[PDB]
């Protein structure tokens, strides 16, 4: 008399197949790429030109002496 089949309690689990967790698509990408890229170029011309100012300063001490 002690056999298995239970009265209730069932799901089931799915046979489904989906995980569309997107994801900033469709022209939202290529937008964070370009602006941060020119931001790095914007970081230039305030350092290389600044080091160029120090570069003439470095060559200044050479020319002032040597007579």
């Amino acid at each position: 008399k002690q056999d298995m089949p239970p009265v209730g309690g069932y799901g089931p689990i799915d046979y489904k197949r989906n995980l569309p967790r997107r994801g900033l698509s469709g022209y939202s990408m290529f937008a964070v790429g370009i602006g941060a890229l020119l931001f790095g170029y914007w970081s230039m011309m305030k350092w290389n030109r600044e080091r160029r100012r120090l570069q003439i300063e470095d060559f200044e001490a050479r020319i002032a002496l040597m007579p």
Binding site: G33, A36, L37, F39, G40, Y41, S43, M44, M45, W47, N48, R49, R51, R52, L54, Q55
Partner: protein, 309 residues
């Protein structure tokens, strides 16, 4: 006491990778829901010291089908240049102040393909004769993909020497103007040093317990070197003259994360099936490399932002 600086760089870098085959597996371990070395360590840390003893106990039988003058010649150069390439590298002070050294790294790494052509050829037949050829044939294709985009950042940094490279990146983290180059830097360097996605890599199977360990010890020597070479180039750190110690604290710890990346990419991906593997260089990589080579010339001109030297 110049000599004691030498021995306190060659010897403390061997334990830097002899204790990495441990770290190779444990990082591989805790992805697969499994633990590290459990019985010997206790925390693993007593494992590779015993395994290093075994390969010099176990008998190195020699091939009767090969020469001897050529067969041990390739492990001679294997520790030769793959350790010599460490020398003009700053932390923050290099051992040698070379006036030009970025060419010097490529000059030494171009002889890495000149070692694999030895061991497969002088040994034996088929596998060691044809199979060892193709591996040169892939690794000859990754100097042109390496050296060109290398040259495109010297146009903006300023010169050839490496000591000025720290000062010019003191505010930048120069991946930000070269994040397209950051892929083709790291992909190409991954492919040359013979690792898991870019692998086809008989040039090992003939080596017994003696000289297999060298061409396992030299190959690992390369991989932290392409980590430490990308480290000074892309992800530059801050410099303090009055506190040199604080440099090296946040220097190797950044290279150690990128060291994990070779261990981390290995746990994801399959191979590339050799006919595609060169086809994805010429057809695909190389036209973008020429385009960005033209890009970093016009833009420092059309900024009046030429780097001084």
């Amino acid at each position: 006491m110049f000599m004691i600086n030498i021995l306190m760089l060659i010897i403390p870098i061997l334990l830097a990778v002899a204790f990495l085959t441990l770290v190779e597996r444990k990082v591989l371990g805790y992805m697969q829901l499994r633990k590290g070395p459990n019985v010997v360590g206790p925390y693993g840390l007593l494992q590779p010291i015993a395994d290093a003893i075994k390969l010099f106990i176990k008998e190195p039988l020699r091939p009767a089908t090969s020469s001897a003058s050529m067969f041990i010649l390739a492990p001679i150069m294997a520790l030769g240049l793959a350790l010599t390439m460490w020398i003009p590298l700053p932390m923050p002070y290099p051992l040698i102040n070379m006036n030009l050294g970025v060419l010097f790294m490529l000059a030494m790494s171009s002889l890495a393909v000149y070692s694999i052509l030895w061991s497969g050829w002088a040994s034996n037949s088929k596998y060691a004769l044809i199979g060892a050829l193709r591996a040169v044939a892939q690794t000859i294709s990754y100097e042109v993909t390496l050296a060109i985009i290398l040259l495109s950042v010297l146009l903006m940094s300023g010169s050839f020497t490496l000591s000025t490279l720290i000062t010019t990146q003191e505010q930048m983290w120069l991946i930000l103007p070269a994040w397209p180059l950051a892929m083709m830097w790291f992909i190409s360097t991954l492919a040359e040093t013979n690792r898991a996605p870019f692998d086809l890599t008989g040039f090992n199977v003939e080596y017994a317990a003696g000289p297999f360990a060298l061409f396992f010890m030299a190959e690992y020597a390369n991989i932290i070197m392409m980590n430490i070479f990308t480290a000074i180039l892309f992800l530059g750190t801050s410099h303090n003259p009055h506190m040199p110690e604080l440099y090296t604290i946040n220097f190797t710890i950044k290279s150690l994360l990128l060291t994990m990346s070779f261990l981390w990419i290995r746990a994801s991906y399959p191979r590339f099936r050799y006919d595609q593997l060169m086809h994805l260089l010429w057809k695909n990589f190389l036209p973008l490399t020429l385009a960005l080579c033209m890009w970093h010339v016009s833009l420092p001109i059309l900024t009046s932002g030429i780097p001084p030297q």
